[PDB]
Structures are given as structure tokens and as C-alpha cells.
Amino acid sequence: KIIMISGANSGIGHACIKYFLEKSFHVIALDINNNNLIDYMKTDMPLKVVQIDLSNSEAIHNLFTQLDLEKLSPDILINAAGIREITPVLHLSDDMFKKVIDVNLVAPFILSREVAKRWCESKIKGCIVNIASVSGLMAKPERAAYVASKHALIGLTKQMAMEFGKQNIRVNSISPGVIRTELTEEYFSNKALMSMIKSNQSLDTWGLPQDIVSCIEYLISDQARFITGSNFVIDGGQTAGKN
Amino acid sequence: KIIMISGANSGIGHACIKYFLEKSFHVIALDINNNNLIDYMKTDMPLKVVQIDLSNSEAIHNLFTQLDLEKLSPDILINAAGIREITPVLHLSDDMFKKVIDVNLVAPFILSREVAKRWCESKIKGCIVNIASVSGLMAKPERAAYVASKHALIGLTKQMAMEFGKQNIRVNSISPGVIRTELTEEYFSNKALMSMIKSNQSLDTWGLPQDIVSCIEYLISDQARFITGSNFVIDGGQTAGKN
Amino acid sequence: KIIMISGANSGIGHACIKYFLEKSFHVIALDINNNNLIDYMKTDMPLKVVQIDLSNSEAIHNLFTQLDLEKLSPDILINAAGIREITPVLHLSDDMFKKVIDVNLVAPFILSREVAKRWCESKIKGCIVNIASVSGLMAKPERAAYVASKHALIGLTKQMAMEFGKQNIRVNSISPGVIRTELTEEYFSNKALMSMIKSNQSLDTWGLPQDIVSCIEYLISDQARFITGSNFVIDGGQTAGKN
Amino acid sequence: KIIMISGANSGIGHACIKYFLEKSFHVIALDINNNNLIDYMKTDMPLKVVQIDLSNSEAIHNLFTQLDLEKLSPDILINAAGIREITPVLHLSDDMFKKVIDVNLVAPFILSREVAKRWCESKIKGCIVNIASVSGLMAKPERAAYVASKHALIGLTKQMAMEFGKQNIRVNSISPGVIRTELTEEYFSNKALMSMIKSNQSLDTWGLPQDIVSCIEYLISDQARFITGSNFVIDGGQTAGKN
Ligand SMILES: NC(=O)c1ccc[n+]([C@@H]2O[C@H](COP(=O)([O-])OP(=O)(O)OC[C@H]3O[C@@H](n4cnc5c(N)ncnc54)[C@H](O)[C@@H]3O)[C@@H](O)[C@H]2O)c1
Ligand SMILES: NC(=O)c1ccc[n+]([C@@H]2O[C@H](COP(=O)([O-])OP(=O)(O)OC[C@H]3O[C@@H](n4cnc5c(N)ncnc54)[C@H](O)[C@@H]3O)[C@@H](O)[C@H]2O)c1
Ligand SMILES: NC(=O)c1ccc[n+]([C@@H]2O[C@H](COP(=O)([O-])OP(=O)(O)OC[C@H]3O[C@@H](n4cnc5c(N)ncnc54)[C@H](O)[C@@H]3O)[C@@H](O)[C@H]2O)c1
Ligand SMILES: NC(=O)c1ccc[n+]([C@@H]2O[C@H](COP(=O)([O-])OP(=O)(O)OC[C@H]3O[C@@H](n4cnc5c(N)ncnc54)[C@H](O)[C@@H]3O)[C@@H](O)[C@H]2O)c1
């Protein structure tokens, strides 16, 4: 199987590249940066790395030209590339709101549409997993674009699941709570902050990239044949309520 | 009180212009069309009509430069301008997805940020109502951008309610079900379709613009003092469940 | 019009009694206590006070046999009677859990079923408003029964809305955030508790019974003709998210 | 490891018995009937079978007395026993509404409290899985008690997850869509009703008990360390929206 994973240079998407490579998949890795993939690019692993700014829809079109010319058509798409602003909403510029939208929502849409197109043409049973967030279900401060983008992606998941259901293409999302990655690593040296995170959820611990990889493994498995349009929350109780 | 209302040339937004002018508000009306607003312009009702493509963030910026020069700032913002594609997702182009997002989400974001900036600097207690949709809570076919945009707008509402809560700026959404307007008018002479719409909800009728205007009236009233971050569904039971 | 209001001796249901008497409704008041309703009974306002334990389903059955004999069938039902435990779940007894369920869920169910039976017989357009809670959408500590009961009542509201929609019987719920009543009075003299409440929501205030009464007023109005199966959150932003 | 599974005689619960015995768990099976479990007791697999009417709370307390004497505390609890009425709500009796509540909500609650009590006393981790339903998230006709009870169980899951999270007791729910079991078997020979079922979801198939077992298997695994308070929908797209 061929799996295409965005966000491959860091955090959850990188954990996925490593995991799926170890399980003998052919991996197409998409990211705007590649410093964490250079070593692997020098090996003979079945890894194709594309350096791509997924905020640029022209660039995504060029990616599918390249993939089609290389006869590479993934079976599975993991939309994990994403960005998060931390900024007072009055200081969030038009261009920055748009940028978050373009990465977190538009790119998943376009990548999903293109893979679905090729699956419908070839009559293949594809699978998409969208990395949303608990911010797709509730708000947080200083994250207007982020929260909007993640709400959007939950909706998109359900919509595309309905759209391609008769073609046996399954589309699901995962909504992580706090996962220790490069995105969130700054939190973990701050005592006050770690205390407040632990206060906002039920388990006295934090997630790791492997917790989300495991979920992905489940959602792409044969055991997930009846799962489509669902959102799986992996958040140590962050969304359960208020305490 | 000054009320800024997008989508003012048609449908819900147009019913709003009429009703609120009738109630002695000063109205700033935004829309890309103005043919229905011309008659009202001929009167000396306190109505400013702006012809503006809200998909162009530069035209929104010019709008607000004009308003600042005129020392005109709204007390209330109704985000009602919206578009809806009906397009099988494999035929939904990058530009069209992004256009729906830019009208349905980015314009409410920018209008909201700009009014809220002026409220925070003046220490005025503002109110924003976003017209989302039941497509902000569930999916529908051939509506990938629409569903994504309406889900986004619901999360944006929650986020901005949170962001501006300490400044006493309330931000709520309304999720209509089927409302007879120029958007949906084509359905109403199709018997097959009308019967399907009625089977998909609880009440044997459809909504009218006035159903949404009355909800807006409540949400901007003093009786809505403790209401923020809420989504008011006005849908004849369309979202209640199945069968 | 006759309006039947449970919880009539205290808090929200008492504020309803007074308000709706003032607008010329005939009121049927249901509560297990009556000390606050005594003054009202002495006047000859059109108020019928019934002292009833709504956790006793046979007493409810008798009430309706009586009401039938007296030709008092309500046109509107407001289910406001409720209780709330604050008990660590390991100390929450079988009986305490069942009682909270019986009062918060079963009583609304039976009352609703009986009023709707009479509307369907008479071909009347009835209206039910269930007072749920934000604890019907998320969890809180030491409130296992309360949370379960309120999630149930949200479900029940949707279900009855669908069941009775073709008969033009509308069924909606209100989910209050923190409303200052006898239920919550103990909180208001604890400063630390009040601070935590306020930082868990958007608005620096709390709700009053009148906030809920005005929402009731809207939902029973003719302007609510297309509203059924909806849950109206009146909560100062408490549910918007975290921070 | 010991797992207690309710509803062990039929459908999902029975599929669990067989599966987890094959995996070397010691299984405490609970059900009001036992005819499908007789054969298993004939082998000497580590299976305790208990005949118990889980609507009877004293019978639950006697169960725990007897397990305490045998020193068998389960490590994992799967609440799968349930019932569903198909009855027009005007014909749904007080007792039948309460019965559905007692089986579908109150028994999960008591079982959960009792296992949690012993996990907290022994300072052992514990894991609960509650079998809710898509009727826990939306309504369906003729199912007032069932929709109520399943909404309640979703809320109870979230609450208990919050309540016991500091003790590392994880509590999650699974919400199946149409699973072919003895509960639903009657539908499958009805051509028209099958066609309506497929029309209401995205995938042209139905679930099997194994689909829910596999979800349980994931929720009780070490890969589920960060999952609590979550609701996993396994429904073929039934909840995605309306088509
Ligand atoms: N870590 C968390 O706590 C958390 C919580 C919930 C959801 N998420 C989501 O998980 C996903 C992955 O997060 P992460 O923690 O691994 O973050 P990360 O920053 O460690 O990795 C994200 C990767 O995405 C890539 N990316 C960003 N913008 C891109 C662009 N324009 N083009 C191509 N690649 C781009 C980044 O360069 C980076 O390598 C994101 O969508 C994030 O919003 C994370
Ligand atoms: N009518 C329904 O059944 C229904 C259901 C749910 C939600 N809604 C929403 O309600 C809102 C109003 O819908 P309506 O039914 O009144 O539709 P409408 O088409 O009658 O009115 C929409 C107006 O918005 C304006 N508009 C669109 N694009 C714009 C642009 N780029 N710049 C400026 N103005 C623009 C249009 O010119 C038009 O006058 C929309 O957001 C719509 O999605 C409608
Ligand atoms: N006040 C809040 O902050 C808040 C928040 C959310 C929801 N609610 C809900 O609003 C509703 C009204 O609450 P309130 O604040 O007015 O509480 P309150 O305690 O002041 O009034 C509730 C009334 O219901 C009656 N009641 C209780 N059990 C009864 C029984 N067995 N039979 C008859 N009457 C019975 C009580 O006697 C009392 O008069 C409740 O369902 C409650 O859960 C309140
Ligand atoms: N099958 C579906 O399509 C579906 C969909 C959503 C949720 N569910 C839920 O999944 C769970 C399992 O359902 P299933 O399809 O296996 O049903 P089933 O009828 O096949 O099995 C239910 C079992 O629960 C037991 N039970 C019922 N009442 C009991 C009592 N008072 N005490 C002890 N045992 C009792 C029954 O005897 C039976 O063995 C239920 O909670 C059901 O509501 C099923």
C-alpha cells in the first residue's frame, strides 16, 4: 500500500512516516520543510518526499502532475500538515487568517478531492484521515482562524464521507487534545502552563505522537470497514466538560 | 442604533433592512447587488447602501476607511451575505471552494474584527449575529465548501464570543433550516423536491425571512444580555434526527 | 391560553408564574412545595396551584384525570421542576440517582406525553419547553445523575419534536448557564467560587430568572412557528470552550 | 485480566464473550437469559456466567457481594445489555419508559460505580466501555425512552470520565449504527426497510458484531492510554447528515 502523509517533517506526520515505513508501506511525505527527512531521503527506504507549500493551490496541482507522472497513486491520505496562531484576534491580519484556512482546510479539501478523483476512476476503496482538533468542537482564546479551520475540517470530513460513500471511500477525522510535539513543545518547560493544561482535562498526562498514530492504524485497518464520517477524540478528557 | 447588514439586497438580509429601518435603526447595507435597495435609497430613510464584493478583502478595508472618515461605526453587525454551490465534489474547483470560503467565512471574520476593534477602542457593548446554517452542524451532498464554511462560522462565533466576552461584545449565530428566499426559490415549484424537504424535517412547512428576522431581533435585544457563543437553530426540526 | 409550569414555587418556574399571570395567561402551577405560591392563591388571579411530588407517577396520572374533569388541558407546558445533587459519584446511591432521573427526566416525559395526547385528540397546536442545562451538553464534577438526566432531556426534546411534528406540536429545550436562584444561591457569598464561575464563561455576570423567562416567551410566541427540536443555550459563554 | 460483559447472551455482548475468551481473558458474563451461554460453561474456559435481571438493583448488589467473596473484581467493564422499544410515544407507558431507563442507563451507572469503587480502593487502573448508540446523538421515531436513555448514557460516560480521571480510570462510549444482531434481525428480510436503512447512511452495507468488538478491543488496549470521555461512532455514515 501507498500512504500519502502531509506534515511529514514534524510531530504527528513524522511519527506516521516512521511508523508506516517500518510497516512496509510505500510513503509519500509532503511538507514545506525537510530538515528532518534529509537522512531518510539518502537511504533506500520506499519514501518519496515532496517539498511543497500546501497553502499554494497551484503547487498542489503541480504535486499531482508529479505523482501522476511517477505513476504514484496513494491508497490512503493522512491530512496532518497544519498551523496554529496564538494571537489576539484584533491583531490577526486578513492574510494570516487566510493562511491558516488555506493550510488547515483548503489543502485537505484539494488533496482529498484529487485522491478521490483517482480512486473513483480506478474503482479503488480509498481511505482519508483528517487531523482536526478539539478546537474543531470548542473554542479557545487567541485562535480565531485555528478554531474556525478545525470546525471546518470536521464538517468537511462528514461531507466527503457522504459524498463518496457509495464509492466505498471512507473519510474520518481524529481530534487530538494536547500532544507533545514541536508545535506544543514550548508549553512543557512552563510549570504554570502545564498545571493549567492538566486542570483542563481528566488524565494527569499528555499525549504523544504514537497515541495519534495508533488511532490512524485503527481507522485505516480492515476493522474500520464500517467507519465513515466519524470524529475520534483522543484528548485525555479535555472535551468532557468543565471542572 | 446603527446596524450593519450584509446580504442586504436579497432574502434574509433584505428582510432585515426593511424591518429594522421600520424600527428606527440607521442601517448600513452591504451587498454586491443593489437593484432591490434603489427604491429605499430614493426615500430619505437613514440608509447607507454600499456596493461591495465582500470576497475582496481590500474592498472591505476601503469600506472601513470610508466609515472612519465619516465617523460612522455600527452598534450591531449582521453577517448574512452568503453563497451556496450545488456541485458534485469532484467538479468543485479550487477557486470555487475558496470563493465560498471567502464570502461565507472570511468576510464575517474581517467585518467582525473591524467592528470589534472600534467597540473595544470606544468601550461600547457591541453585538454580532452570524447567519450560519444547519449545514454548520451536519453534512449535505454536493456542498463541500458550503458545509465547511458553515461549520467554520459556527466555531468562529464561539471563538469571538470568548475573545470579546470581557469587553461585553456578544457574538451569536443562527442556523436556519429551509427558508424561502431567492436562494431556494427554485425548489418550490418542484413537487418531488418539496415532498422530500418536508419528509426530512418535523413540521410540514418552510420558513420565511421573517422567522430569521424575529430571531435576530431577540438576539440583539436587552433580553439577550446573557446570550453569547450560542447557535439558535430555526429549522422545523430538520436537525432532530432521522425518519 | 392555559400554561402549565412545573417548579412553580422557586427560581425559574416561580418567575414564570408571575410573568405569565401578568400577561393574562391562565396558569397551572406544579410543585412539591407551595409556601411561595400562597400569597398568589388568595388573590383571584387565574392560578391553579397543585401540590405534587412529580417523582410519583401515579400522582401525575391523577392530576391529569382531575384536569380532564375540570376541562383544564394546558395549551403550553414548561418543564422546569428539577433537582441537582452535588455528590462524589462513589457516594451517589442507587436511590439518589433514580430520584434525580425521575424528577429531571421521567416527569417531563409523562407530563409531555399527557399534554400531547390531548392536543392530538383535540387537534390543538401545543408547545412544550423543557428546561435542560449546559450539563446536558457537557459534564461537570459530582453530578453523574444530573448530567445524565439533562443529556436525556435534550434527547427527549428532539425525539418528541420529531414524534409530534406532523401534529404541529413544537418541542424545544432551553439550556441555562449559571442563573441566580435558590438552587445556586449558596455560591454567591463565596468569592473564590464566583471568580472561578466567571473565568469559566465569557461574560462577567450571571443570569437571572428573567433571562430564562424571556427565552420562554420567545419560544411559545407566534414568531417561534418554525422552531422545533431546538436547544437554546442561555449561558454567558460558559459552553463556548476553554480558557 | 478479568472482563465483565453485560448482554452476554446475544448480539454484541455475545460476540465479546467469544472473542475475549479466545484472547485468554477471564470473563464474567451477565445477562437475564443464558441459553446461548450453556455450551460455553460445558467447557472449562475461564468464564463465569451470571443470570441477573439488571433492572433490579438489589440483584446487582448481590452480584457484587458474591464477587467480593470469590475475590473476582473485574479489570474492565463492558456495558452492553440493552433494550429498545418500538412504540408510538402516546402508547408508551410509564413503566416501559422507566424500564428502558433502568436497563440502558441505571444499570450502566450502578455497575460502573461498583467497579470504580473497587479500582479506587485497590489503587488499580480500570477501564469502562459503554455501548450507547447513534440514538444518543439524534432522534428517531417511536423511541422516546431509547433516545433518552442513550443520550443519558453519553453524558454519563463524559461525567464518569471526569470524575475518575485522576485515578486513571478511563470511561468511553461506542455509538453503533445498524449492527445485524438479534435486536435488529427482523429488518433484514424486509426489502423496503433495508433500502431505507441504506439510503439513510453513506456505506451500502451494515455492521456486524465484530465491528463493535474490534472497537472495544482498541478502547481497552494500551494504545488507548490517552482516550477518556470519548464517544466512538461506528455507523456507516448514518450520522453524517441528510441526503
Ligand atoms: N500537537 C497538538 O497538541 C495538536 C492538537 C490538536 C490537533 N493538532 C493538529 O495535528 C496536526 C499536526 O500537528 P503537529 O503537532 O504534528 O504539528 P507540527 O508543527 O509538529 O507539524 C506540522 C507539520 O505540518 C507542516 N506544514 C505546516 N504548514 C505547511 C505548509 N504550508 N505546507 C506543507 N507543510 C506544512 C509543518 O511544516 C510541520 O512539519 C495539525 O493539523 C495540528 O493542528 C495538534
Ligand atoms: N435560504 C435558506 O434556506 C438558508 C438556509 C440556511 C442558511 N442560509 C444562509 O442565510 C444567509 C442569507 O441567505 P439568503 O437566503 O438570504 O440568500 P440570498 O441569495 O437571497 O441573499 C444573499 C445575498 O448575499 C449577497 N452576497 C453573496 N455574495 C456576496 C459578495 N461576494 N459580496 C456581497 N454580497 C454577497 C447576495 O448578492 C445576495 O443579495 C446566507 O449566508 C445563507 O447561506 C440560508
Ligand atoms: N439555576 C441554575 O443555574 C440552573 C442552570 C441550568 C439548569 N437549571 C435548571 O432549571 C430548572 C429550574 O431550576 P431553578 O434554578 O429554578 O431551581 P429551584 O430549585 O429554585 O426551583 C426548582 C423547583 O422545582 C421543584 N421540584 C423539585 N423536585 C420536585 C418534585 N419532585 N416535584 C415537584 N416539584 C419539584 C422544587 O421544589 C423547586 O421549587 C431545573 O430543571 C434546573 O436543573 C438551573
Ligand atoms: N444492534 C444495533 O443495531 C444497535 C445499534 C446501536 C446500539 N445498540 C446497542 O447495543 C447494545 C447491544 O445490543 P444488541 O444488538 O447486542 O442487542 P441484543 O438484543 O442482541 O442483546 C442484548 C442483550 O442484552 C440483554 N438484556 C436486556 N435486558 C436485560 C436485563 N434487564 N438484564 C440483563 N440482560 C439484559 C438481553 O437479554 C440480550 O442478551 C444495546 O445497548 C443496544 O441498545 C445496538
Numbering used by the authors:
A (entry chain A), B (entry chain B), C (entry chain C), D (entry chain D): 5 to 247
The authors write:
The electron densities of succinate molecules, K144 and Q242 are clearly observed in the active site of all four subunits to HILDHE144K/W242Q. The side-chain amino group of K144 forms a hydrogen bond with the side-chain amide oxygen of Q242. A water molecule is trapped by the side-chain amino group of K144, the side-chain amide nitrogen of Q242 and the C1-carboxy group of succinate. The carboxy group at C-1 is recognized by R88, R147 and Y191. The O4 atom is recognized by S139 and K144, but not when the O4 atom is substituted by a methyl group in the 4R form of 4-HIL, the hydrophobic methyl group would hardly be adopted by hydrophilic S139 and K144.
HILDH belongs to the short-chain dehydrogenase/reductase (SDR) superfamily.
